[PDB]
Design a protein around this ligand. Structure first.
Ligand SMILES: O=[P@]1(S)OC[C@H]2O[C@@H]3[C@H](F)[C@@H]2O[P@](=O)(S)OC[C@H]2O[C@H]([C@H](F)[C@@H]2O1)n1cnc2c(ncnc21)NC/C=C/CNc1ncnc2c1ncn23
Lengths: 176, 173
């Protein structure tokens, strides 16, 4: 199946490489006193898994209560003949009543965009593939030594009375 | 199937985004970065598709006649909540009798590493062939593919990766 392969490549080509280095990058960021005064960055990578596979490029677009703060110090690695392939991650402030409620490294699971592009014009099959992607990735990370309470999957369906920031803050507070 | 999905994601998540900007980046390198006496970097992205899915991280490992020259000027784009996701590509000199015979932007199709890490050698060879077949069909139909991308699919049996790439470079001129 398509989703089986996308989930395994998402682990093998990304999460396997960055999760071992994530604690050290977030720690490096938090150890700068002027960063920490704004607020401590949470110690997990938060991965948004919208089951409708709607992956916008900007999080501020999806919810203005998700505000871009800064980038993590980037990780580099030689891979498949590309010298210094760069792994960049973005830090976001989550607003509640116009005030910062939390700070975290937050992004969409990009492979869902492939499932969406494959079937924008089948919505039932896309929902099945999205669920399979999440289920498979959950099983990989459950068994993987790189996943050590440093990664949180946030799977959701939109009901347009929805708060993405509240969904993230729900998960963020549970980990604290 | 796995390879069908990997091929489509390789187009949608990479080739679709970088191939429209590749001519401008190679032109920028040839006009501003390339040393006065060095041969021009060729105008196409050369993608190595080893059917055994053996994808080393360094090209000098697979053949020492593939020498790293420089990196292209990097491309950035906001994507899936990551601000300024960076697309970096590496330029290689291909040596013949110790001297440069061509220069090109060269890399492996990284998704083959996923097929390798993942189902016997025979099944893996079938998935690699399906990956190549599917990617060929996508690029045949795609407006971003305008003679600016070259797929180099090969089976190793005494084999020269540099000669295989130089064969394709010479066909384009
Ligand atoms: O196994 P791979 S290396 O990655 C799978 C998956 O893992 C995830 C993401 F979700 C991926 O899917 P996608 O974005 S639709 O790309 C599908 C394939 O196209 C190919 C490459 F073959 C991809 O397959 N591809 C994509 N980007 C990219 C690239 N340089 C060269 N080839 C690239 N530079 C930009 C950023 C590179 C590092 N930074 C990353 N940041 C975030 N997520 C990341 C990164 N690298 C991986 N991933």
């Amino acid at each position: 199946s398509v989703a089986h392969g996308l989930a395994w490549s998402y682990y093998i080509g990304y999460l396997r490489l960055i999760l071992p280095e994530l604690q050290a990058r977030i720690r490096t960021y938090n150890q700068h006193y002027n960063n920490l005064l704004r607020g401590a960055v949470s110690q997990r990578l938060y991965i948004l898994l919208p089951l409708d596979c709607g992956v916008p490029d900007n999080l501020s677009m999806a919810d203005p209560n998700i505000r871009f703060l800064d980038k993590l110090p980037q990780q580099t690695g030689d891979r498949a003949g590309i010298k210094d392939r760069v792994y960049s991650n973005s830090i976001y402030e989550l607003l509640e009543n116009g005030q910062r409620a939390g700070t975290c490294v937050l992004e969409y699971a990009t492979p869902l965009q492939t499932l969406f592009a494959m079937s924008q014009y089948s919505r039932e099959d896309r929902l099945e593939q999205a669920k399979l992607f999440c289920r498979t990735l959950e099983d990989i990370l459950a068994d993987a030594p790189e996943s050590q309470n440093n990664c949180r999957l946030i799977a959701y369906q939109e009901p347009s009375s929805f708060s993405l920031s509240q969904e993230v803050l729900r998960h963020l507070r549970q980990e604290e």
